[PDB]
Design a protein around this nucleic acid. Sequence first.
DNA 1: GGTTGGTGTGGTTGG
Lengths: 32, 251
Amino acid sequence: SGEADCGLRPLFEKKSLEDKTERELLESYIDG
Amino acid sequence: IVEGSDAEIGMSPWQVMLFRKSPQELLCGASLISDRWVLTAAHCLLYPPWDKNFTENDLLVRIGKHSRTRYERNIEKISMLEKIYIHPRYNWRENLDRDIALMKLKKPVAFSDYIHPVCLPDRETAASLLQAGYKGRVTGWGNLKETWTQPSVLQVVNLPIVERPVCKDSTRIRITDNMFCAGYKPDEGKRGDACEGDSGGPFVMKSPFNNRWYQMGIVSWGEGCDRDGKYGFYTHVFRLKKWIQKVIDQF
DNA sequence: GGTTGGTGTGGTTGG
Ligand SMILES: *[PH](O)(O)OCCCOc1cccc2c(OCCCOP(=O)(O)OCCCOc3cccc4c(O)cccc34)cccc12
Ligand SMILES: *C[C@@](*)(O)[C@H](CCCNC(N)=[NH2+])NC(=O)[C@@H]1CCCN1C(=O)[C@H](N)Cc1ccccc1
Ligand SMILES: [K+]
Ligand code: NA
């Protein structure tokens, strides 16, 4: 029963901008 | 948060502060999951051993905050609780099994650049993301160091999930299916952990399918803070998701 | 100061 717009940050996703250390999160998925 | 860094403005817009009304003390973390509902660790509200049994009128909840102490004028929004719902089968006696609690707010909070709700995972998302070696994110205003050895702004740290084998043989405390640990192994070079005053604080991962953020964990317990061989434990949000929906729709 | 630190052509915000 997820909320319509949840999990999308106004100052990041909503502006196609990435935070300082979110790439680290993605790397984990690949060579983790 | 131990060995983390200062968050960026709006990095974690679902991050919520449980604030004690009398006196003024930071209690715990929490996360905003709608405009009316907030999620936290149950041991933040009800832990008899420490003589903690708070109720709606003991606590307000602060949203949109970054600075730990200052009232961020024109940024933060303060809300009062309508009701609290500690999980029925919450075992505070033994091992904090089912360390989860919901809170409805009197009036719905408005969303801004600093206030936005997080998503709860589902069958598929939990299956995909919640796997060993896969890193999540922890945020809180808790202690920078272990008790026997506090930040000025919200602290963030990225921490890899750990397999139950290594997760169970780490502690003498009985584990359940409603938990998972996270943190670096002693050889892994990088280190870091949640600490005291981080409970309720969300453990989030970012879906690489839809670029949405999902709250996979709640900060529950530890054994010191960031010591080799020890890992922080988190409430498994999905395995309790059935309970969460129940509570919302009924109330 | 303030429901709030430190130092402002604010800042994540007035005055
Ligand atoms: P609105 O526009 O209706 O009303 C807002 C106007 C009120 O302005 C201020 C009131 C109080 C404080 C400040 C302020 O504080 C900054 C403190 C740190 O700077 P400092 O300690 O170095 O002080 C600056 C040095 C010069 O001092 C003064 C300058 C002008 C007037 C006075 C005064 O009347 C008494 C004492 C010192 C000074 C920053 C800006 C505005 C206000
Ligand atoms: C309430 C939270 O602030 C806090 C978070 C723990 C952070 N630790 C790390 N490094 N991950 N939780 C606690 O302090 C919990 C609540 C009750 C006691 N407790 C502990 O962490 C104990 N040290 C361990 C424990 C005791 C009894 C039952 C389960 C665990
Ligand atoms: K000011
Ligand atoms: Na550790």
